[PDB]
Symmetry: D2
Subunit: 173 residues, 4 copies
Amino acid sequence: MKPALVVVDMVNEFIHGRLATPEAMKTVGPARKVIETFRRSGLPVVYVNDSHYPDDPEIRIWGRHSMKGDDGSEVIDEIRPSAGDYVLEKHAYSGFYGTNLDMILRANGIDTVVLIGLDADICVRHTAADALYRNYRIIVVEDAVAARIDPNWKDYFTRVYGATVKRSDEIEG
Amino acid sequence: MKPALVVVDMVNEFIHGRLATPEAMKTVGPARKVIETFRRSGLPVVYVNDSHYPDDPEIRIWGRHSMKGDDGSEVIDEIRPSAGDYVLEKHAYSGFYGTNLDMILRANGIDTVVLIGLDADICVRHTAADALYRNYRIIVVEDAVAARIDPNWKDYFTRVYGATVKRSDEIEG
Amino acid sequence: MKPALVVVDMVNEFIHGRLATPEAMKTVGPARKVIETFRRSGLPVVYVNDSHYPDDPEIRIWGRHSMKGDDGSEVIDEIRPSAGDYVLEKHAYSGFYGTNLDMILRANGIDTVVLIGLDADICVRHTAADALYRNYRIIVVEDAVAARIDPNWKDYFTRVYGATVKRSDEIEG
Amino acid sequence: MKPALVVVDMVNEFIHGRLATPEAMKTVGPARKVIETFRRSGLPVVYVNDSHYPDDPEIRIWGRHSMKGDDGSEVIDEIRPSAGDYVLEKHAYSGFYGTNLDMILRANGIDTVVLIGLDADICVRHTAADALYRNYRIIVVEDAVAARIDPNWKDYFTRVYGATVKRSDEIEG
Ligand SMILES: [Zn+2]
Ligand SMILES: [Zn+2]
Ligand SMILES: [Zn+2]
Ligand SMILES: [Zn+2]
């Protein structure tokens, strides 16, 4: 296995600001733990963050959120990115759509994505879908992901994306 | 509005054959009804059908199904395509991934996709996501789509893709 | 016609710095003129600039150039982007690959791309190619584009991408 | 190295039929030679053939050619595909655009594409670009490719895509 960690939407507006929830806050400790081990082990860490324009397709659905330029779209300080970490702006749910995520994964010979962040129903899941199409294996760190609407999310990942589910305190590296 | 109809995985495998959902049969009369009205009105009809190779990414998850060359991957006779419905082979959940769906829709000036077929909560849903990404409006025909795992699938479409839900017996054309 | 202006790689390293040429310098006046008219007319202006990582595929070919973070990848001051202009980072020759260029064009209902910048042999041409695949019409402003290796570039655009060639002092708006 | 052979537009239209280059005939013996060695060695062989609709973007440029359903879009008998060579229909210059080429290459763990067919300076070249974007190494077989407009095509491949150029009678397998 050669994995990269993809950290989805761990940004101020969903953790600290206007759309903050406790489910979201609960992810921060575990996320820092997962991020830290990947770094200490030299493997790629990639942040993929909403950085929306007013006319992005999904703005009609949600209204303005995690806008480009506004501090809402910035990664929370708790897991501030370091030198060597990749930071990507995205305009749709999936971390792959309109981004160079796939490039970075291919350039570092990656065959497995480890997914954490916000959230199990929308962006994490959508990123997972695209990973599958592109023949990556998928791992999700349950305690580092927050649900929104679906309580059967874990089941969906496993049954539909063949994902294996782990906890932050586990590490196959 | 200028819509195209995208007919997802109405193949023998998902209807009559092996992986068929129980309510999957019930979509066939509504699907024929929707397809017919689109045809009678000159608008594009596109069939997107799993046509798998043994090493497609999702084979490890589901095992062999709707394989290229085998009759399981063939559109059911009830709604046999005419010339010139478009018939596309796909290798992943989304009707857009690795296909020329978007080309067809762009070439015919389309701004709205009308979605029917199987599964409501998998291929139809993954087709909807990629439609949203590409700035198409989305319509799902509730009685021409079959769910598999999620019973809250209608809610997901509307809340996550801003889709509007219609019945086969309705027509805004 | 509803056009957007795509301004390719008008960045310091190719105009002012390490890979500066007079062909390149010659584009600046005309580019400012084209950019200005688009702005004065409310139509979208999109800068697409190399912002490379060390391991981008093309770095093996060219060595480091227009690197992310370094002033070489910054747009020249002469045509500094304004409020409302879009500024995109790209990692390959085409302005579309791994970017949200197509999103912006679709969100603003665009059907024609007007191409200027660096250069007619590589990035402008590659961007043109992708525009074609995505069913845009193509216009190139000859005096606002610099050749590198091919002297028959104008012929290639017209014969292969069906591009129409204009001069900066002309305007169909 | 783990290579796949991509065989571009060796169809009746480009060889025997209407738009055929004069030296296009001369590629057929080398192409068969390259194809045969790949087969004898178990490596993937993928045919990518124009299979146009009347409203594909390039029809306005070239007029009708290599149309879907017409024998002009059929692979020449000299190098008839076997089972299981992959045979892909494409609608644009690049063998990647709107196709599942990348899926096949990824599923077979490929890191290098070997390119033959027509035209050296159009479809073969546009296939090379998209290969570079996707971090594949590139090999062109000079005698199994035919130029159309540009006589400096070999130089373009090497200088712009870092391609290495080989003859059909050579084999690094
Ligand atoms: Zn968002
Ligand atoms: Zn399937
Ligand atoms: Zn570059
Ligand atoms: Zn063609």
